[PDB]
């Protein structure tokens, strides 16, 4: 049995005095009425802030953490196994509709990896090299200068 | 497990591997959910005329003549819900979404589960079907498809100690209620489901309570009419194998 189903006989259906559930006055106005007066509480404050650059002058980088790559090495058997070599571009989803691929250094790297990507974060390298690995900046990647 | 194959004479003619799906654990909640959705999805949208009760310039006189403020026209009360000939306050609405969604995985799981309920004589018997057989579902040679006469299928079912269920379904019920006024005077027990592979069995379809289907598209309702698992079924050598990859 639901709450609705139990209201017959109650008269007020939970509204309290039958003088309560009328028009918008019972809501202090329609929509966001009073968001600066009677109901200012918890509302974001009023005002303009910042600016936006045109959407076609904006770059969307496709990112990935070493942790993701590293935990799936053996499974990514369909990619180089040298002294592993992996072109991150062939790993990241959304890499297509992105302006470039970037390797971030979140997590650990328990293997020696030769990563190929358009860009890496300082920590991404330190960890990769740290595990006797290497980092190869793609041709596009050659946009840092 | 293995299932016995039968020839059109009712004699055993070898046997095959009962596909793994028939091992799927029976899940009546998922099966019921699946049947509930298929049943809802074929319901038609309805609702009263949106202007019903509203075609009137009826006005209220307000205070003054010792009468309640009810819209009236030609001395007759109108429009409002409490008024006879007035509008319906909260009537059936056409814009209402009367369909039910169901994830493909969840639906397919119910199909497999309904399939598995078909291989359990105890369940099949609990569902209500009448028969003197022990092995279930009933598997038959693909020649079954070449049959043409209904009475031929009758002979085969009797030879298989399964015709008893058709006698069960050979009783129609004249329902209580006004369904009758809308074309739903009768209803009847669900009997044997015949699952073939090329085309539904034209020869078996007219049997009392019988349902015909094809391995490629047999659904949860076929296998569990009303959402009750364990329907007495009869597969076809090929149907059995094809149904395995559902």
């Amino acid at each position: 049995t639901s709450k609705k189903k139990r209201q017959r006989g109650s008269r007020t259906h939970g509204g309290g005095s039958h003088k309560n559930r009328r028009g918008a006055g019972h809501r202090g106005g329609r929509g966001d009425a009073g968001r600066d007066k009677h109901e200012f509480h918890n509302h974001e404050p009023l005002g303009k802030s910042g600016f936006k650059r045109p959407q076609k002058v904006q770059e969307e980088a496709a990112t990935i953490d070493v942790r993701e790559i590293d935990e799936n090495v053996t499974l990514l058997a369909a990619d180089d196994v040298a002294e592993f070599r992996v072109d991150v571009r062939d790993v990241v989803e959304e890499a297509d509709d992105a302006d470039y691929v970037k390797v971030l250094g979140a997590g650990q790297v328990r293997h020696e990896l030769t990563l190929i990507a358009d860009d890496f974060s300082e920590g991404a390298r330190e960890k990769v090299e740290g595990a006797g690995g290497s980092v190869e900046l793609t041709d596009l990647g050659e946009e840092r200068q | 497990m293995q299932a016995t194959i039968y020839d059109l004479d009712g004699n055993t003619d070898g046997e095959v591997d009962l596909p793994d799906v028939f091992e799927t654990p029976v899940r009546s909640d998922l099966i019921g959910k699946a049947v509930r959705a298929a049943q809802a999805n074929r319901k038609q949208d309805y609702g009263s005329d949106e202007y019903a009760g509203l075609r009137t310039p009826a006005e209220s006189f307000g205070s003054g003549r010792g009468q309640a403020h009810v819209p009236k026209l030609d001395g007759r009360a109108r429009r409002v819900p409490q008024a006879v000939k007035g509008r319906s306050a909260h009537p059936p609405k056409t814009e209402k979404d009367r369909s039910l969604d169901l994830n493909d995985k969840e639906r397919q799981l119910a199909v497999r589960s309904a399939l598995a309920a078909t291989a359990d004589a105890d369940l099949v018997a609990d569902r209500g079907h009448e028969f003197d057989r022990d092995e279930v579902p009933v598997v038959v040679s693909d020649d079954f498809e070449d049959l043409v006469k209904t009475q031929e299928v009758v002979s085969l079912l009797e030879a298989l100690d399964v015709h008893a269920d058709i006698d069960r379904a050979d009783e129609t019920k004249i329902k209580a209620g006004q369904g009758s006024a809308r074309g739903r005077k009768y209803r009847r027990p669900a009997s044997i489901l015949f699952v073939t592979s090329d085309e539904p069995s034209t020869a078996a379809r007219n049997l009392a309570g019988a349902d015909v289907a094809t391995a490629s598209e047999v659904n949860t309702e076929d296998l569990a009419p009303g959402g009750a698992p364990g329907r007495l079924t009869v597969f076809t050598e090929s149907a059995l194998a094809e149904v395995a990859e559902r």
């Binding site: - | 009758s180 006024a181 809308r182 074309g183 005077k185």
Partner: protein
């Protein structure tokens, strides 16, 4: 259609030429064999046996066939009015069976004897 309202409606409002089928009656065993039909449209000449009402068991000549009301009068199947006069008690052909045909009409006979068509 399958809807009861439409079925009865199509029957009550069927044009005249479509009402002949509302006055058809099953044929005796012999007649069915003779003309290869299970039933026929009762004519004011046929002989018929009543198989269901209070007059079940009686046989007589058909004296009238009303298409407007889809009923037939059969000789001796009557009711006695208050004054005493004897009037016919209308019968639904569905409760009757033809035991002898009136083939005085070549078109009818030809129709019955044909195979592709039935009378």
């Amino acid at each position: 259609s399958k809807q009861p309202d439409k079925q009865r409606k199509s029957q009550r409002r069927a044009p005249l030429h479509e009402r002949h089928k509302q006055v058809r009656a099953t044929l005796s065993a012999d007649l069915r064999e003779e003309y290869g039909q299970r039933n026929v449209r009762v004519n004011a000449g046929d002989t018929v046996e009543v198989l269901r009402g209070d007059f079940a068991g009686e046989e007589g000549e058909v004296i009238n066939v009303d298409l407007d009301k889809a009923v037939i009068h059969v000789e001796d199947v009557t009711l006695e009015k208050t004054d005493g006069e004897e009037v016919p008690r209308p019968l639904d052909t569905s409760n009757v069976r033809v035991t002898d045909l009136d083939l005085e009409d070549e078109k009818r006979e030809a129709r019955l004897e044909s195979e592709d068509d039935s009378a």
